[PDB]
From a paper:
Furthermore, the crystal structure of a close homolog of Sas20 domain 2 revealed a unique bilobed starch-binding groove that targets the helical α1,4-linked glycan chains found in amorphous regions of amylopectin and crystalline regions of amylose. However, a single maltotriose molecule was captured between these modules with amino acids from both lobes coordinating the ligand. The aromatic ring of W509 in Sca5X25-2a interacts via van der Waals forces with the hexose ring of Glc3 at the reducing end. The O2 and O3 of Glc3 is stabilized by hydrogen bonding to the side chains of Sca5X25-2a N564 and Sca5X25-2b N684. The aromatic rings of W661 and side chain of K654 in Sca5X25-2b interact with the aglycone face and O2 of Glc2, respectively. The O6 of Glc2 is within 2.5 Å of the side chain of Sca5X25-2a E508. Glc1 interacts with W620, and its O2 and O3 coordinate with the side chain of N687. Sca5X25-2a and Sca5X25-2b overlay with an RMSD of 1.0 Å over 49 Cα atoms and demonstrate a conserved binding platform; when maltotriose is included in this overlay, the ligand displays the same polarity. The φ (O5-C1-O4’-C4′) and Ψ (C1-O4’-C4’-C5′) angles of maltotriose in our structure are φ = 107.5°, Ψ = −144.3° and φ = 90.8°, Ψ = −153.7°. The first φ/Ψ angles that is near the end of the chain is more obtuse, whereas the φ/Ψ angles cloistered within the binding cleft are similar to those found in double-helical amylose.
Ruminococcus bromii is a keystone species in the human gut that has the rare ability to degrade dietary resistant starch (RS). This bacterium secretes a suite of starch-active proteins that work together within larger complexes called amylosomes that allow R. bromii to bind and degrade RS. Starch adherence system protein 20 (Sas20) is one of the more abundant proteins assembled within amylosomes, but little could be predicted about its molecular features based on amino acid sequence. Here, we performed a structure–function analysis of Sas20 and determined that it features two discrete starch-binding domains separated by a flexible linker.
Author numbering: 492 to 732
Amino acid sequence: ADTTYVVAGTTNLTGYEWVGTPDAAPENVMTADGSVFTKTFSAVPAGKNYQLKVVANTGDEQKWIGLDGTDNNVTFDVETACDVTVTFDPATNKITVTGDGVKMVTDLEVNSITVVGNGEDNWLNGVAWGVDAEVNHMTQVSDKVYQIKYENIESADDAYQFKFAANDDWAASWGLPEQSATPIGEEFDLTFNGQNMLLNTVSAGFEEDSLVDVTITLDITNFDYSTRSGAKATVKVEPST
Ligand SMILES: OC[C@H]1O[C@H](O[C@H]2[C@H](O)[C@@H](O)[C@@H](O[C@H]3[C@H](O)[C@@H](O)[C@@H](O)O[C@@H]3CO)O[C@@H]2CO)[C@H](O)[C@@H](O)[C@@H]1O
């Protein structure tokens, strides 16, 4: 079974938005090199939070491979414009990123959190997937606790989707393991690089089209970057005042 490896990642690194198919991103197919595979990106600009994964393509079947045996994106900065080489070893699933200007990201300092989602009218202030929209910056109400409120939302199911994004980009984000309804009125654990959260207020007991006020709280007091574990949220829904 013939396997083709593709570097998928951010548009700024790869020229495509997380495209893992050889026919769709032929420039990012990795070349056979000894017992491993290599892809060099020419003159990558100085920048922060470049991200990639290696995608194994065997016919229609895709396997997305993240950092050092995890499902995390490989995340690095480039200090000075340089050629970045990505190495992949099928025997170990080791991904290496090398180059004079390359520095691996090994920690996260949160300076902002954006609520990002399918905004319309009062829902996320009308912003459609705006990762850096100031109006959806959560307020830091204490050390590592963030809150935002959306008032006068029409109660609906399968209408409202959202995630949390740190530092006005997608490098550090939270959602759920599968795209599914958020727990309502109870603290729940968040998945780093997770799927969209659904805010299904009819299923939460608020009559369709009735107005509700939504209060979202994000607690990263026990978030550990090394494990990507410990971020928690609460989504409070109340009849509108
Ligand atoms: O731009 C609209 C788009 O925004 C959101 O997608 C972002 C993801 O939430 C975010 O995690 C990241 O997703 C990539 C993963 O990091 C990566 O490991 C791999 O799985 O590819 C993912 C992209 O397919 O970046 C995207 C933005 O490109 C939102 O969740 C989407 O519903 C929405 O369409």
